[PDB]
Amino acid sequence: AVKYYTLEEIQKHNNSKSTWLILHYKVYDLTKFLEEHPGGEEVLREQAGGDATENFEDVGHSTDARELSKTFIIGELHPDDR
Ligand code: HEM
């Protein structure tokens, strides 16, 4: 099932490669995706250990990309956080 994770859990996943971020409470495991992503690694890693809902939704991307994104959900905001 979804691995319920607090901001903390993501905040801990932020290293040179080790990259997690949040896109509407849902935690996206982009550590692999860095190298796949047409928008590169740097950006995602910079957003790492935080809610990048902002950056995804503000960049806007594409329906397809919005829907591709789901494949990287590992977790979601702790029921106290959420
Ligand atoms: C987790 C969801 C993500 C997925 C699956 C994803 C997917 C993609 C895809 C498919 C593109 C190509 C353009 C398009 O068709 O939309 C793209 C471009 C891009 N992405 Fe992402 N992305 C994700 C998250 C992010 C985040 C959080 C950032 C910001 C740190 C970001 C920054 C960019 C940038 C700057 C581009 C380049 C736009 C251009 O072509 O000028 N993406 N992404």
Curated annotation (Swiss-Prot):
Assigned keywords, A-Z: Acetylation, Electron transport, Endoplasmic reticulum, Heme, Iron, Membrane, Metal-binding, Microsome, Transmembrane, Transmembrane helix, Transport
Record protein name field: Cytochrome b5
Gene Ontology cellular component annotations, sorted alphabetically: endoplasmic reticulum membrane; intracellular membrane-bounded organelle
Domain Cytochrome b5 heme-binding: 2-78
Positions annotated to bind heme: H37, H61
Residues annotated with N6-acetyllysine modification: K3, K12
Biological role stated in the UniProt entry: Cytochrome b5 is a membrane-bound hemoprotein functioning as an electron carrier for several membrane-bound oxygenases.
Keyword Heme listed: yes
Topology with respect to the bilayer: Single-pass membrane protein
Section of the entire sequence shown: 8 to 89 of 134
Protein family: Belongs to the cytochrome b5 family.
